Structure 1
Amino acid sequence: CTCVAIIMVSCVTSVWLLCRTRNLCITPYKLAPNAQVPILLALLCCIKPTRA
């Protein structure tokens, strides 16, 4: 019961910092939809594909 608490806390903390990294991927680029997008930051580091 102590071992499943470590595997639950560290799971929801590592994906919490990953969700912050996912969120900060976009707000440089959702603010200017006319700007072009590199192919490295589209699918490798972040999730958003090319749209519009």
Structure 2
Amino acid sequence: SVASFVLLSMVGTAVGMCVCARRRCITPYELTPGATVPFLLSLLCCV
């Protein structure tokens, strides 16, 4: 019972870290007037 809980906590943390990186990565492009997000960032990374 204990081992299952701990393993579940480890996976959930990895997901949270990915969300944090994505938001800080992309944010600069949403403030510039007339800017367009490059293809690679729009589709594949920091989506």
Per the normalisation by structure 2, the TM-score is 0.71
**Where does residue 8 of structure 1 map in the other structure?**
8
Runs ≥4 residues deviating over 3 A: none
**Alignment gaps of 5+ in structure 1:** 48-52
TM-score of the two chains, using structure 1 as the length reference: 0.67
Query: Normalized per residue, which structure has more helix?
Result: 2
The count of corresponding residues between Structure 1 and Structure 2 is: 47
- Identity within the alignment, %: 40
Q: Which has the higher contact order (CA 8 A, sep 6+)?
A: 2
